[PDB]
Amino acid sequence: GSSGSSGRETYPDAVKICNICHSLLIQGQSCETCGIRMHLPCVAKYFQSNAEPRCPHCNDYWPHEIPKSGPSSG
Ligand SMILES: [Zn+2]
Ligand SMILES: [Zn+2]
8 A cells, every 4th residue: 555645736847837928927928818927028018009909829818917028020
């Protein structure tokens, strides 16, 4: 016998991954429709110069607001 189990999700970079760059993030924007996090400069870069933003995952609608971009990439 001497069996064992574990019910805890503990990963170094397997908990909150971006949807634009796919990089471990901590603070940003998440979707309540499906459940995906995105960086600040990532969410905007995807919802820049548009009318109605759509989650890059479920593709329904962005419940949160759209962040601003920086002087980078242009
Ligand atoms: Zn990102
Ligand atoms: Zn979504």
